[PDB]
Amino acid sequence: ALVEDNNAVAVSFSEEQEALVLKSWAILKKDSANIALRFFLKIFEVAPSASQMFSFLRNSDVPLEKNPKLKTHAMSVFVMTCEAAAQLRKAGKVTVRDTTLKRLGATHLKYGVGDAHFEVVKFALLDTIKEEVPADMWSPAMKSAWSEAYDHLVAAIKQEMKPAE
Amino acid sequence: ALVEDNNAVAVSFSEEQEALVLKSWAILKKDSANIALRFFLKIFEVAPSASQMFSFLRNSDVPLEKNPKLKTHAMSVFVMTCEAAAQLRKAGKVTVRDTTLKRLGATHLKYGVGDAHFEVVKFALLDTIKEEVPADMWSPAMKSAWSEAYDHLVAAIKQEMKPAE
Ligand code: HEM
Numbered sequence: 544a545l546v547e548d549n550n551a552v553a554v555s556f557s558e559e560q561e562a563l564v565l566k567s568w569a570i571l572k573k574d575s576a577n578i579a580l581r582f583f584l585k586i587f588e589v590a591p592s593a594s595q596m597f598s599f600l601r602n603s604d605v606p607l608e609k610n611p612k613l614k615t616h617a618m619s620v621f622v623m624t625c626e627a628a629a630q631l632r633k634a635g636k637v638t639v640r641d642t643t644l645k646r647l648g649a650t651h652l653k654y655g656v657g658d659a660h661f662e663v664v665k666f667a668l669l670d671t672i673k674e675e676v677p678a679d680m681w682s683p684a685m686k687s688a689w690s691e692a693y694d695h696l697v698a699a700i701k702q703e704m705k706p707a708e
Numbered sequence: 709a710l711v712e713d714n715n716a717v718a719v720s721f722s723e724e725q726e727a728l729v730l731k732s733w734a735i736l737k738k739d740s741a742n743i744a745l746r747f748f749l750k751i752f753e754v755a756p757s758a759s760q761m762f763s764f765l766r767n768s769d770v771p772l773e774k775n776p777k778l779k780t781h782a783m784s785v786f787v788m789t790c791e792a793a794a795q796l797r798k799a800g801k802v803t804v805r806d807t808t809l810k811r812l813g814a815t816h817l818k819y820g821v822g823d824a825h826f827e828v829v830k831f832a833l834l835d836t837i838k839e840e841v842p843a844d845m846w847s848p849a850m851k852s853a854w855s856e857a858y859d860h861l862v863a864a865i866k867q868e869m870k871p872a873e
C-alpha cells in the first residue's frame with residue numbers, strides 16, 4: 544500500500560471495524576446457504592466469464608445452483624475475509640499460513656484470475672452483505688471494514704502469484 | 709445456439725427490441741454528459757482496474773471526471789450498441805465497416821481488454837440505463853434488448869482480436 548509504501552505498510556484496522564465485520568458475519572451465518580448463493584449469482588451477473596472458471600464436470604452439476612465448488616468457494620471468500628479482519632485487528636497484517644497462501648497464489652494464477660476478477664468478487668461480496676444485513680446495521684463503515692479485510696487478503700494472495708523479484 | 713456470435717447466421721432481434729433501445733437511448737441523449745459520467749463511475753466502482761486502462765486526471769482543475777476522453781468512450785459504447793441493435797434488426801448481424809472493426813479489435817487487444825472487462829462494461833451499461841429511464845419503461849425486455857445488441861457488437865470486435873477464423 545502506497546500510504547507509506549516500502550516493504551512494510553501500516554495496516555491499521557480497528558476493533559470497531561472488526562466488530563462490524565464480526566456482527567454482520569454473525570447475521571450472515573444464520574443463513575449461509577442463501578448468502579453464498581446470492582453471492583455467486585452476483586459474480587455471474589457481473590462477470591459470467593468468472594463463474595466459468597469453476598465449471599462442473601466432476602460433479603456434472605450444470606445448474607449454478609448445484610455447483611458445489613460455488614458454495615464452497617463462496618464460503619471460503621467470506622470466512623477467509625472474516626478471518627483476515629480478525630488478523631488485521633490482532634496482528635496488523637494478514638496471517639494466512641505460508642503454505643496456504645502459496646496454494647492460493649498457485650491456484651488463482653493457474654485459473655487466470657486477474658485484478659478485474661478480484662474486484663468484481665469484492666463488488667459482489669459487498670453488494671451481498673448490504674443486501675443481506677438489516678438496513679439498521681449497514682453503513683459506509685461496515686462496507687469499508689469488509690473492503691479493507693478483503694483487499695489485504697487479496698494482496699497477500701497476489702504476492703504468491705508473481706515473482707518475489 | 710449458444711455460440712458467442714453469429715457472423716451472419718440466425719439471430720432474431722425484433723423491431724420491438726430495437727424500439728426499446730431507441731426510445732430509451734432517446735431519453736438518455738437528453739442528458740448525455742450525465743449518463744456517460746454515471747456509466748464510467750459505475751465501471752470504476754465495479755472494476756477500478758478497468759478505468760485504469762484509460763487516463764488519470766487532467767481537464768479543468770476539478771477531481772470529478774471532466775476528461776473528454778471518457779465521455780467520448782462512454783458515448784461510443786452507447787451509440788455503437790444502439791446502432792448494433794438497428795443492424796441486428798435490419799440485417800440480422802452486426803454490420804460495422806470492416807475497417808472499423810479491425811481498428812476496434814486492434815485497439816482493445818492493444819489495451820489488454822478481456823472478457824471480464826467487456827462483461828463489467830455491459831453490467832455498467834445495463835445498470836446505467838435502468839437507473840436513468842423511468843421505472844415505467846424499464847423492464848426485463850428492455851434489459852435483454854440492450855444486452856443482445858451489446859453482446860453481438862462485442863463478439864464482432866473480439867473476432868478481430870484473435871487470429872483469423
Ligand atoms: C480473497 C478472495 C478469494 C479467496 C479468499 C479465495 C479462496 C479460494 C480457495 C480457498 C480456493 C480453494 C483451492 C485452494 O485451496 O487453493 C480457491 C479456489 C479457486 N478460486 Fe478463489 N478465492 C478468492 C478469489 C477468487 C476470484 C476473484 C476468482 C475468480 C473470479 C476465484 C476463482 C477460483 C477458482 C476457479 C478456484 C479453483 C477452482 C476450484 O475451486 O476447484 N477466486 N479460492
Ligand code: HEM
Nearest residue numbers: 758761762784785788811812815819821825826829861862
Ligand atoms: C462494445 C463495447 C465497446 C465499444 C463499442 C468500444 C468502442 C471504442 C471505440 C470506438 C474506441 C476508439 C478508438 C478506436 O477507434 O478504435 C475505443 C477505444 C478504447 N476502448 Fe473501447 N469500446 C468497448 C468496450 C471497451 C471496454 C470493455 C474497455 C475496457 C474496460 C474499453 C477500453 C478502451 C480503451 C482503453 C480504448 C483505447 C484508449 C483510448 O480511448 O484512447 N473499451 N473503444
